[PDB]
Each structure stands twice: as structure tokens, then as C-alpha cells.
Amino acid sequence: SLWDIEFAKQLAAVTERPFQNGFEEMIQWTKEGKLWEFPINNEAGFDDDGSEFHEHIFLDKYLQDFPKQGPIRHFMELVTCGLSKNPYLSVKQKVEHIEWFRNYFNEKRVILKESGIQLN
Amino acid sequence: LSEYAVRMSRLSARLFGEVARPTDSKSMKVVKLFSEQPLAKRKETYDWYPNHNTYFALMGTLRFLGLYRDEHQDFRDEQLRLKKLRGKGKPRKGEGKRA
Amino acid sequence: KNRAARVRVSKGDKPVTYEEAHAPHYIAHRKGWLSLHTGNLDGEDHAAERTVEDVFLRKFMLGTFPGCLADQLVLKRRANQLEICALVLRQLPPHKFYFLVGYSETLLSHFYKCPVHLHLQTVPSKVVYKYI
Amino acid sequence: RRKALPPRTEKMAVDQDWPSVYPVAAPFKPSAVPLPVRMGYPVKRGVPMAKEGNLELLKIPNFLHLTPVAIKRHCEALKDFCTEWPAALDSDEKCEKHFPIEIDTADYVSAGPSIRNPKARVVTLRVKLSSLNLDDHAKKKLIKLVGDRYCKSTDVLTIKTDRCPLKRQNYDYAVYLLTVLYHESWKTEEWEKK
Amino acid sequence: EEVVIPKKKTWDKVAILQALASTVHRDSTAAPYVFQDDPYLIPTSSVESHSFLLAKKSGENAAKFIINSYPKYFQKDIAEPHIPCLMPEYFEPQIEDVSEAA
Amino acid sequence: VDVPKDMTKPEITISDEPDTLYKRLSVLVKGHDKAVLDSYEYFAVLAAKELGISIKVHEPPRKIERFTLLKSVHIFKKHRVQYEMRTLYRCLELEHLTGSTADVYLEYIQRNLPEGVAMEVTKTKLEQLPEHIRKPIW
Amino acid sequence: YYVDWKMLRDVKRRKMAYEYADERLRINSLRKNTILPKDLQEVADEEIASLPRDSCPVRIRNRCVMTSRPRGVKRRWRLSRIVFRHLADHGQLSGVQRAMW
RNA sequence: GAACAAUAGUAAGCACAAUCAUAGCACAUAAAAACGUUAGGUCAAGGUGUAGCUUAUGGGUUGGAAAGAAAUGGGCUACA
Ligand SMILES: [Mg+2]
Ligand SMILES: [Mg+2]
Ligand SMILES: [Mg+2]
Ligand SMILES: [Mg+2]
Ligand SMILES: [Mg+2]
Ligand SMILES: [Mg+2]
Ligand SMILES: [Mg+2]
Ligand SMILES: [Mg+2]
Ligand SMILES: [Mg+2]
Ligand SMILES: [Mg+2]
Ligand SMILES: [Mg+2]
Ligand SMILES: [Mg+2]
């Protein structure tokens, strides 16, 4: 409602005053978000979409749409191990890589059949 | 080297998340390809040169608005004015060679 | 002959500041650094960003306060807030000085996405250290 | 019209409290500092320059807001936030038997707009194997499972996890690694008998 | 039976800063914090005190005017926490053709 | 004489959660000059003694990084200019810390940290045992 | 403007490399392995050759920020050996001082 | 422009020296070394006064920038 904001700005005008101390300056800037949250933590403001270690380390659940005994598993276990040890990529970002691999392998069907090894 | 030690190492790699089956060093490169960020995605690489256009445009706009005073550009303008008054200015595009 | 950051001696009538009168080999011996930050430590990073920000601040402030600046600025970087200390000749009225400082405190903050403090010390004239 | 106002020095009281004028970090304005301090290399026939217009005094960080009186006054108010350390763990000998797990966590602070530091994700786990319920076979299997991560001179197992992006995720992964290493050391498979 | 675990105390992010501020009271011979501490900039009368603050606020508003009029010169963000208070504000509506959304 | 009254208005609550326990807290402050580090160490120990922390202080060895550049602009390699970067370290050791005590100490420590120095904080978090290792059988 | 046309080209090369970073990584993952059959590796080589020239990270040149000098630059400061000296001799860089030992 | 048992010399200042750094002194090293000479090197670190280009001496893409008849400077390997 516009009237709620109209009544809130009147309150804000009365509460707002010129700063008398640097302590008040720092308090106001911290409440606004300019000042760092002390004690400083290098992970403040970043939550990685609320994921945990099992969304990063364990990626074998995304390898179901691949041949289990073929060389595709041997190739993809290395990329999953790399993504698990990669801290610079997110869980959703790794999903893009594995889905791109799924799409590419399922698109290039003639070559995998001509290679002599059965693949799905 | 024994089968017991091989099984122990294979299980240790599985529990630590390393590569389970034996693989060659040349094929191990794909592991490092994903374990670390690529060079083109590094912040020290893709953010090497600051956007000089932003700085130049902001400074010129401030100078025209009347907040920043650029001595170098003022000197350039004074020299250009003096050269044009002397008689050697900037030729118009399309007539320098033909006309 | 070394010529870096070295003002040549005239006949004995030019005024020089304390920073100008000391050669660059006297840095950390007789005079300190004009800027302080953690980027130039051993195990730290992000030094080029701090250097380019510092040089942009120098060039911006030189045009912001033309002719009234006494000496080089002091750029202190302390916990995400950047303090800029300057010595200015009392040539401009305080009405214009407050306008300029209020303009800068917001422009630099919004340009560098960090809080800034600006402090000015008014001097009647440039302080002379050696022969004048 | 030019005006020259005298500084606060003529108005500063001798017994007036200092932290009131310097509550936080300040750029050391000479007008509010009643102490005549000369800084700089003196001339052969001269003296070091006074505090007025001295860039040397402005370059250095001033500790006028951290005088001992101000520190005591601040800590008197901060005494209300802290909790009392239990006396039951005065010596590390009891701390080892009560809390055998040690978690080393790194924190860094640097001046600048950015906060992310790649070394913040590192979490180290230290567990003394003399405080666990491992049997002989379980201990012998676990030593070979961990390999070089466990030393014999000190008998402390160390876990160095850096795979997770977040520090909390790394801590949870270290706890999971400790759990699985303890659990799988008791399982005897068919290839152990050979 | 012997291990004693104390309880934790949870406080606001600025509660400790307010506790720090409570220790220091107002100074007698000191000008208000908003004005510059340099004597040449210290106001002398009430009209001068009002005028200096008005001039500073006018400069702040002029800077904000440039920031709003040229958003593209401040779109690049360097601070990791991504503070929105310092981002330029847009006066143009997003949708013009749709009457309901306009 | 004009002292304001009732200036202390804190908001402190005691949560039912057990407080975090810390074994050893190492603070390594690195800087360029030694006077700043000495003053900072004096301030830190004076603050810690009032709170009763029994702080231990020692100075790790410094590290000097030197490099060499050309002295002239176009062609002069026989003459060089060598630049030096000194890094001095001060180590403060705290023992027998609690979650709130460490927080309140780091509040008064970091807020007054000098601009020319940086700080690395290492915490030895104390835990008894995880829930799945108390007395499990597979 | 920028410092030089060479710098204006280099920033475009860096932008293109950033844009094509993931695709090149995915393609190279198919070339730097021996598990996959060699039939698809040639197709992957053709695909990576079909990519734009300025997409590979080998074309980037670490020039100076201020003067765009192709050589004599320091990676830590991204500045040439001359601009670095000019800034350091004025005391504008913290912790930097003449080496005397 | 000088006679120390003194005969027109006082002299700010820049140099030299001292100090600083190689974490204790001393030594050594490092650093520093003015005013000027070589119209010494650098319009190609960067900007520049003057004189010249503007459907080009400007801006982009691809492909090539060999080779040694021969002489010489500085280094590595040795000729045990
Ligand atoms: Mg150019
Ligand atoms: Mg003389
Ligand atoms: Mg000595
Ligand atoms: Mg000597
Ligand atoms: Mg020498
Ligand atoms: Mg000497
Ligand atoms: Mg010549
Ligand atoms: Mg020549
Ligand atoms: Mg040129
Ligand atoms: Mg030429
Ligand atoms: Mg030859
Ligand atoms: Mg040679």
C-alpha cells in the first residue's frame, strides 16, 4: 500500500539525523550493508544455492543414462571425479557439463556404432 | 606388490573419491581439466584489462558537465585551436586526396 | 645520472616539499609510502586492482581540486572502507569545499562499490622544507 | 573574505578525556591534536617540521583511538558479551580425553572490496587414534587405508579436505570421511584372507 | 560428569558496535562529526552551519543525479557482497506496449 | 558536566545451543613496518589481559622478496635497479577459548586493525565425537 | 578509447576466450584421452578447428594496463617495468622500496 | 681572492662526508654521487612542439617473413 510507505517515510525523516560519531556512522553503514560483517568470514553472502558436500562429491547418480560396462563409464568417472574435486564450479554448473556430454554422445550415433563397440 | 595391497589401494581411492580403476597418465589429463578452473575463466585472465572506455567516457562527461578539469585535454584543445588559427587544421573526410 | 622522482636543484630559489626533497632511495628510510594496503604483502593477492584504483583516484582528484592541492594524496585501505587524506590550499570557499567533498564521497563510493571517507586539511600555502 | 580559526588546542582541557575526541580511526587532524610533535628528517641548521601541514604524520597509522584508557573503557563494556571458560579443561591432558577431535579452520582478512579467499575453504581434521574403539585388525586396516595421512611417531590421523567450495561443506565432508573410514575398517571382505 | 559446556550468547551484528559507542560520550570542544574538522571549514554561526550541510547535500544530490543519468558507467560490480544501495536507479518503465504492465 | 544518562542499551540473549569451544587460536599479523606491528601487539596484549586470555606472543621470521628491473628505458642491461618488499610477521597465541569469547575478542581486534597490515586467523575447533562413531557396529 | 588498437584487439580476444572457454574445455576433454575410440577424436579435432580463431586462450597477450607494452611487464601488478618504477619511486606503492643489502 | 707564529676573505645551499640497509658493533658490500661534457641512447614504455596522412602513411582477416658464400662478439661442452 502507498499509504504505508507514506507513513514510513515520515518516520524515517524523524529518525534520520546527521551523524555525531564515527561509531554511529559505522553502525548505520553496517546496517545498510556497506560495512563488512564483523567478525569477517570469507563465505559471507555466498551459500552455493544451499547445497552440501553430497551435491558436489557424489555425481554417480547422473550417470544412469550411459552404458555401465562400456568405455563411456571409464571416461565419465574421470570427469565426475574432476568435478567433485573442483570447488570453482557449482552443482548446477556440473549438471550442464554432464548433460552436454549426454547430448553429444546420444547425437553422435553413427560413429559409436562404427567403432565396433556397442554403446547406448 | 600383492593382490591384497591392490585391493586396499582400490578401496582407499573409492572411499576418498579418487580414480578407482587403474588409468594411464595421458588419460589422467582429463581429470585435471575439470578439477581446476580453465585459464580463460580465471579472474586474473578475463579481468586483466580494466574497461578504459568507461573511465574515458565518465571523465569526459564530467569535464563537459563542469566537475572535472582535464589539463591534458585542455592543452590538446588549446593547441588544436592555435593550429587551426594558423591555418593547418583537420581536412574533411572525402576530399583530402581528391580535392 | 639518476633522474627518477628527483627534482633538479635550481640556483637556490625554488620551493620544494618534504616528499619532493627526498630521493626515491630514501623511501622507508626517511619518508614513507603515499598509499597503504595489504595487496603488496607476501601471501596476499589483488594488487593490480588496488594500484589501478589508486592511480585513478590520483588523476581524478587532481582535476577535482585544480590548483589548490598542496601535495600528494594519502590513500589508506582499511577493512573495505577507503580513506583519502589530502592537503588543500585555502583558495576555495568552504561553501564550495563542502560541495566538492559531498560530491566525491558519493561518486567514488558508487564507482568503486565500497565506502569512502574524504578528509581535507587546509593550509595557507605549500609547506617548504628545503631552500625556498 | 578569508577567515583563520584557531585550533582546539587553546580550548582543550588538561583533564578532558581523550577517547571522546578520537572514538574511531581518524586521519590525525592536527587541529584536534594538542600534542606538539615534530616528525621528519631535520635540516643541518633547522628542526623537524611541526605537525601543521606535515605529510609524514598523516602517512603513518595513528593509534590515538587505542590509548590504554580507551582500551580499558571499551573492554569494560565488552566483558558482558564473553562467556567464562570452563575450568575442567585447564590442562590439555583432560582436553585430549574429553574432546579428541580437532578442527583447524583458517580465516583471512584483507583490505579491499572483495571478500572471497580461495584458502578459506581449507578445513583440517586431526584425530588421535589412541582415543577410539579400534581393534587390532581394524587399526591395522585403517593405517593402510589412510596411508601417509596418519603418522606413527605421534599417532594422529590427519584429513585435508579442499574439494567442497564452502567451508561448512568441507567440514561436513571431513566428518563424512572420518565416519566412513571408521566404519569400513571393521568390514572384512573375501580378499582380506589372502 | 566433569565436562562443563557453557551456553552461547547471540547478539546483533551492530549490538557490539553500539556497546562500543556507549563508552564514548560527546566531546565539549569538538565540532559535530558531519562538518570537516579543519578550522577553515568549521562553521562559525548557525547560518553557516546550515549552509555548509546544505551545500554538501547539494553535491551529494548532484553526484546521484549523474549516477542515475549515466547508469552504464557504474554497472560493473567489484564488491563480492553485491551491496544494492550503491547501484544506479532506473526511472524508465520496463514494458510499454502492454497496458496492464505499463 | 553535561553527561547523558542511560547510554548503555545492549541486546544480549543466551541461546540454549551449547557454546562452541576452541583449543588454540593463532593470529598471524603481517605488515611492512615493525613499529606498527609492535604497537598493535601491545594493544592486543593489553586488551587480552583485561579479558583474561593469557595471550602468548612470538615473532616469526620475516620474509624479504627482491626483484631486478632494467635501469634505463631503451637499451641498458649492465645497469639495473633492484626493488625489495619486506614482510614482517607477529604471532599471537590464545588458548582455552570459547565461541563467544573468541568472537568478542576478534571484534575488538579486527575493527581496529591498521590499514597497512593483514591478519590470518587459525581456529582449533573442539569437538568430542560425531554421532556415528560413539559406539556403532556397522 | 583504449590505449592502443592492439589492446582493443586483445580485450576482444580475451572476451571471446571467456565466451568459448567451456566449449573448448569440453572438446579438449574428448581429445586428451585414450579411452575413447580414435574415430570420434578426428571429428572432435574438426569441430575444434571449426571454432573461431580468437577463441583459443593462446592468442591472449599480457600487455601493460597503462601503456599496453607487450614486453617487460610484471604479472603481479600488470604494469610495465617502466610504469612500475615511475609509480614506485614516488612512494605510491606500499611496501615497495629500493633493495639495499 | 691563500700563508695558522696567518698577508682579504665571510658565505645560506647542492655535492663529499655522516647517517641509513645487509636485523649487535668494526670492516666490507650495497646504496648515493651535484653543476656540466659527449646536439650520447630512447618520437617504437607513455604524452608530446613543428612538419605531413583522412575511400589512407588509418582500421580488420588469411598466408608468408626464408637460406647461408663468408666474417666476428659473448657464453656452454670438452680436448682427459
Ligand atoms: Mg599511442
Ligand atoms: Mg657554503
Ligand atoms: Mg648496522
Ligand atoms: Mg664505512
Ligand atoms: Mg654502486
Ligand atoms: Mg655518501
Ligand atoms: Mg645524436
Ligand atoms: Mg640514434
Ligand atoms: Mg609517439
Ligand atoms: Mg622513428
Ligand atoms: Mg657465429
Ligand atoms: Mg652480454
CA distance B98 to C13: 57
Check: CB of residue C41 under 8 Å from CB of residue G94: no
**Nucleic strand H within 7 A of Cβ G53:** yes
Ligand 9 centroid distance, CA of C102 (Å) = 39
Check: CB of residue F98 under 8 Å from CB of residue D83: yes
Question: Which residues, other chains included, contact A105 with Cβ-Cβ below 8 Å and sequence gap of 6+?
Answer: A66, A72, A112, A119
Mark yes or no for CB contact A71/G37 under 8 Å.
Answer: yes
Check: CB of residue C68 under 8 Å from CB of residue C56: no
Mark yes or no for CB contact C78/F114 under 8 Å.
Answer: yes
Taking CB atoms and an 8 Å cut-off, how many pairs form between chains F and G? Answer: 33
Sign of torsion, CA C87 C92 C96 C98? positive
User: Which residues from the 81-120 window of protein chain F have CB within 7 angstroms of nucleic acid chain H?
Assistant: 82, 88
Sign of torsion, CA B16 B19 B22 B23? negative
Residues of chain E contacting residue B67, judged by C-beta atoms under 8 Å apart: 66
CA distance F114 to F116: 6
Specified resolution (Å): 3.9
Of F113, F121, F128, the CB nearest to D107: F121
State the amino acid at position C18 in one-letter form: Y
Mark yes or no for CB contact D145/B11 under 8 Å.
Answer: yes
Cβ-based neighbour number of residue D96 at 10 Å: 15
User: Which residues from the 54-73 window of protein chain G have CB within 7 angstroms of nucleic acid chain H?
Assistant: 54, 64, 67-69
Chains B vs F: touching, with 3+ CB pairs under 8 Å?
no
> How many angstroms is C1' of H57 away from CA of G54?
28
Ligand 6 centroid distance, CA of F63 (Å) = 28
Mark yes or no for CB contact A86/B31 under 8 Å.
Answer: no
Residue among F2, C85, D35, A17 nearest E32 (CA): A17
Check: CB of residue A104 under 8 Å from CB of residue G47: no
Residue D178 main-chain phi, psi, to 5 deg: -60, -45
Check: CB of residue F105 under 8 Å from CB of residue F48: yes
Q: Is F4 helix (H, G, I), strand (E, B) or coil?
A: coil
CA distance C3 to F83: 17
Residue among A5, F101, B82 nearest E7 (CA): F101
CA distance A35 to E81: 10
Determine contact: E80 vs chain D, CB below 8 A: yes
Question: Which residues, other chains included, contact F6 with Cβ-Cβ below 8 Å and sequence gap of 6+?
Answer: none
Q: Is the peptide bond before G57 cis (omega within 30 degrees of 0)?
A: no
CA angle at D159 for the pair D85 and D107, rounded to the nearest 5°: 55
Residue F84 Cα, gap to closest chain E Cα (Å):
30
Chain A residue with CA closest to G36: the answer is A71
Ligand 6 centroid distance, CA of E80 (Å) = 50
CA distance A76 to A56: 15
Mutate to test the interface with A, among F22, F108, F110 (most CBs of A within 10 A): F110
Question: Which residues, other chains included, contact E68 with Cβ-Cβ below 8 Å and sequence gap of 6+?
Answer: E88, E89, E91
DSSP H helical ranges for chain D: 55-59, 68-78, 92-98, 136-146, 167-184
Check: CB of residue D26 under 8 Å from CB of residue D62: yes
Cα end-to-end span (Å), chain F: 73
CA distance G96 to F65: 10
Task: Fill in the DSSP letter of residue D87.
Answer: G
> How many angstroms is C1' of H42 away from CA of F71?
13
Mark yes or no for CB contact F107/A39 under 8 Å.
Answer: yes
Reduced 3-state DSSP string for chain A = CHHHHHHHHHHHHHHCCCCCCHHHHHHHHHHHCCCCCCCCCCCCCCCHHHCCHHHCCCCHHHCCCCCCCCHHHHHHHHHHHHHHHCCCCCHHHHHHHHHHHHHHHHHCHHHHHHCCCCCC
**Nucleic strand H within 7 A of Cβ B88:** yes
Residue among C60, C66, C38 nearest C104 (CA): C60
CA distance D118 to D83: 32
Q: Grid coordinates representing B55?
A: 573511465
Question: Which residues, other chains included, contact D133 with Cβ-Cβ below 8 Å and sequence gap of 6+?
Answer: F135
Which subunits count as partners of chain F given 3+ CB pairs below 8 Å? A, C, D, E, G
Ramachandran region, residue D104 (left: φ > 0; alpha: ψ -120 to 50; beta: rest): beta
Mark yes or no for CB contact G100/F84 under 8 Å.
Answer: yes
Residue C25 main-chain phi, psi, to 5 deg: -75, -10
Q: Grid coordinates representing A42?
A: 570469507
Look at the block and give the residue holding cell 586462450. Answer: G57
Q: Grid coordinates representing C119?
A: 578528509
CA distance A13 to C89: 36
CA angle at D159 for the pair D155 and D160, rounded to the nearest 5°: 135
Domains of chain G are 1-91 (1.10.287.1480)
Residues of chain C contacting residue B71, judged by C-beta atoms under 8 Å apart: 62-63, 66
Chain B residue with CA closest to A98: the answer is B34
Check: CB of residue C30 under 8 Å from CB of residue D41: yes
Of C45, C71, C113, the CB nearest to D55: C71
**Nucleic strand H within 7 A of Cβ B90:** yes
CA distance C34 to C40: 13
Of D23, D24, D166, the CB nearest to A43: D166
Which nucleotide is closest, CA of C1 to its C1'? H33
Residues of chain F contacting residue D100, judged by C-beta atoms under 8 Å apart: 128-129
Residue among D81, E20, A29 nearest F105 (CA): D81
Taking CB atoms and an 8 Å cut-off, how many pairs form between chains C and G? Answer: 61
Range F56-91 burial, b when 16+ CB lie within 10 A, else e: eeeeeeeeeeeeebbbeeeeeeeeebebbbbbbbbe
CA angle at F39 for the pair F34 and F43, rounded to the nearest 5°: 145
Ligand 4 centroid distance, CA of F82 (Å) = 22
Check: CB of residue G76 under 8 Å from CB of residue F65: no
Q: Which residues pair with F85 in a beta bridge?
A: F65, G96
Check: CB of residue C125 under 8 Å from CB of residue C104: no
β D123-128/F80-98 pair status = unpaired
Of D107, D109, D165, the CB nearest to A48: D165
Which nucleotides along chain H are within 7 A of a protein C-beta? 12-15, 20-23, 29-36, 41-42, 44-56, 58-62
Check: CB of residue A59 under 8 Å from CB of residue B17: no
Question: Which residues, other chains included, contact B21 with Cβ-Cβ below 8 Å and sequence gap of 6+?
Answer: A74, A77, B10
CA distance E52 to E58: 10
Q: Is C119 helix (H, G, I), strand (E, B) or coil?
A: strand
Mark yes or no for CB contact F63/C42 under 8 Å.
Answer: yes
> How many angstroms is C1' of H27 away from CA of D26?
46
CA distance D2 to B46: 52
CA distance C29 to C10: 25
**Helix C48-64 and helix B52-65, axial crossing angle in degrees, nearest 10:** 10
Chain B residue with CA closest to A79: the answer is B31
Determine contact: D138 vs chain F, CB below 8 A: no
Determine contact: A46 vs chain D, CB below 8 A: yes
Q: Of all helices (H) and strands (E), which one includes residue D153?
A: none
DSSP H helical ranges for chain B: 3-16, 29-35, 43-46, 52-65, 71-86
CA distance A71 to A118: 10
**How deeply is C1 buried, as exposed, middle or buried, from its count of CB atoms within 10 A (0-12, 13-18, 19+)?**
exposed
Cβ-based neighbour number of residue D61 at 10 Å: 21
Chain B residue with CA closest to C47: the answer is B44
Beta strands in C14-99 (DSSP E): 35-36, 74-78, 81-89
To 10 degrees, the CA torsion angle through C106, C109, C113, C117? -140
Mark yes or no for CB contact E60/C102 under 8 Å.
Answer: yes
**Nucleic strand H within 7 A of Cβ D45:** yes
CA distance D145 to F138: 17
Give me the residues of E, 52-91, that contact B with CB < 8 A: 66, 70, 72-73, 76
Residues of C at the A interface, defined by Cβ within 8 angstroms:
79-81, 109, 114-115
Check: CB of residue C98 under 8 Å from CB of residue C84: no
Of F66, F70, F87, the CB nearest to G99: F66
Mark yes or no for CB contact D194/B4 under 8 Å.
Answer: yes
Residue among F66, A36, F116 nearest C38 (CA): F116
> How many angstroms is C1' of H68 away from CA of C36?
58
Check: CB of residue A44 under 8 Å from CB of residue D115: yes
Q: Is F31 helix (H, G, I), strand (E, B) or coil?
A: strand
Sign of torsion, CA D27 D28 D30 D34? positive
Mark yes or no for CB contact C28/F30 under 8 Å.
Answer: no
Mark yes or no for CB contact E5/F19 under 8 Å.
Answer: yes
Task: Fill in the DSSP letter of residue B89.
Answer: -
Q: Grid coordinates representing E33?
A: 562529526
Which nucleotide is closest, CA of B93 to its C1'? H54
* CA–CA distances in Å: residue A1 to residues A4, A5, A8, A15, E101: 6, 7, 11, 21, 18
Residue among F12, E10, F21, F27 nearest D84 (CA): F21
Residue D107 main-chain phi, psi, to 5 deg: -130, 140
Check: CB of residue C119 under 8 Å from CB of residue C81: no
Check: CB of residue C11 under 8 Å from CB of residue C129: no
Check: CB of residue A31 under 8 Å from CB of residue A55: no
